[PDB]
Amino acid sequence: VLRDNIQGITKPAIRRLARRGGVKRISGLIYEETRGVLKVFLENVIRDAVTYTEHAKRKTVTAMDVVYALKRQGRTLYGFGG
């Protein structure tokens, strides 16, 4: 079926993440909203990660690119290079 992959983030996955966050009850309107938030985040990292791939005249996005993209947004990641 022709379905958008944002719905590939299943409801049990969101429940698992919430339970790791420490929440007892989950309303039914979170499920569509959280995906939207998850979109926005990926719209502010991949966009940067592609630009570095532009500046190196490369065609494959490497882990260093995403680490640098996350570094400039005050969200530094450890253990994936750099």
Binding site: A13, K24, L42, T60, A63, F80
Partner: protein
């Protein structure tokens, strides 16, 4: 009822794995990156780092959302809490 949920709460706060299935996340990342440029190739470590960072962000978001919900004498979290958390943290308005 109300105690099997706390069982999960305690279980997941100890284990340290990826709570999102890898293939749908890969498809989502590829589709999101398609618009910027067609015909891209992805390092596996790049995808893993993306998923790790996104999961950490979501966990922090839900922590703040739970604080917001507790503030209003509730136990259930609703989008009214997520919007407030995002607004006061600084990603919107």
């Amino acid at each position: 009822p109300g105690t099997v949920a706390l069982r999960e709460i305690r279980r997941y706060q100890k284990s340290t794995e990826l709570l999102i299935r890898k293939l749908p996340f890969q498809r989502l990342v590829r589709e999101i990156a398609q618009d910027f440029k067609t015909d891209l190739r992805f390092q596996s470590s790049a995808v893993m780092a993306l998923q790790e960072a996104c999961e950490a962000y979501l966990v922090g978001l839900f922590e703040d959302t739970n604080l917001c919900a507790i503030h209003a004498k509730r136990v259930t979290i609703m989008p009214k809490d997520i919007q407030l958390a995002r607004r006061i943290r600084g990603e919107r308005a």
